[PDB]
Amino acid sequence: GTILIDLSPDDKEFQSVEEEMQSTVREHRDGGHAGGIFNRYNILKIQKVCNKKLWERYTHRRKEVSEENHNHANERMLFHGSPFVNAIIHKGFDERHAYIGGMFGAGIYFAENSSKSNQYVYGIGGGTGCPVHKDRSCYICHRQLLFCRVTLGKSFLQFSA
Amino acid sequence: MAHSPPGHHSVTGRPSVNGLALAEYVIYRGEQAYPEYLITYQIMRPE
Ligand SMILES: O=c1[nH]c(-c2ccc(N3CCOCC3)cc2)nc2ccccc12
Numbered sequence: 556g557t558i559l560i561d562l563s564p565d566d567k568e569f570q571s572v573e574e575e576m577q578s579t580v581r582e583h584r585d586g587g588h589a590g591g592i593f594n595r596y597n598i599l600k601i602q603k604v605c606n607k608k609l610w611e612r613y614t615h616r617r618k619e620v621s622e623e624n625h626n627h628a629n630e631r632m633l634f635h636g637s638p639f640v641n642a643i644i645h646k647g648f649d650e651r652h653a654y655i656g657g658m659f660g661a662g663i664y665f666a667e668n669s670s671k672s673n674q675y676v677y678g679i680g681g682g683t684g685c686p687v688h689k690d691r692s693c694y695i696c697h698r699q700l701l702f703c704r705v706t707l708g709k710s711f712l713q714f715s716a
Numbered sequence: 717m718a719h720s721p722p723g724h725h726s727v728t729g730r731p732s733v734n735g736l737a738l739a740e741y742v743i744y745r746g747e748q749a750y751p752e753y754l755i756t757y758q759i760m761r762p763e
């Protein structure tokens with residue numbers, strides 16, 4: 556039941572999403588090993604992901620969290636990179652999208668920095684890079700990221716390297 | 717997946733070394749995220 560609706564580059568919604576993408580690029584401590592060397596993106600397309608069932612499943616849980624946290628969902632918009640973005644948009648997030656070896660336990664990871672999520676588009680550590688060229692810094696191949704609505708509720712603060 | 721720490725719905729990974737890094741977040745229930753936008757892009761080679 557997922558449909559993808561293309562946003563026009565002239566739409567304010569396209570423009571605010573592109574700006575969040577571009578402005579949250581940073582340098583990474585791997586010198587670009589996992590995600591490639593770049594300071595900015597060429598945005599090719601932004602699509603709205605519309606799935607009534609998955610939306611209702613999200614808002615249902617959002618309300619449960621909210622009611623457990625003084626009517627505060629603590630909702631953010633965050634990036635997610637994954638080889639399984641195509642499954643996510645059709646079936647939603649679940650346990651199979653979890654990063655088992657992540658630094659904060661087995662769960663589903665999101666980033667404020669778009670360039671951090673970019674490191675995971677081809678797998679953990681960038682895997683072996685693009686399917687076509689086996690290049691983690693491929694400048695030709697089209698990559699996909701998700702920009703997601705995420706309910707944090709009461710979040711456990713872990714200070715970390 | 718693991719569970720959230722007791723009494724919490726997520727974890728926030730606060731950067732405590734790299735001064736420029738933004739936060740990262742973990743949820744333990746897939747129902748706590750909705751994939752709103754699919755962004756297709758290329759990384760650009762620096763000039
Ligand atoms: O966007 C992210 N994706 C991922 C990510 C990590 C692992 C996966 N996998 C999904 C299930 O198969 C194993 C690989 C998917 C996504 N990790 C992050 C960690 C920190 C900040 C952001 C991310």
Ligand SMILES: [Zn+2]
Nearest residue numbers: 685688693696
């Ligand atoms: Zn390639």
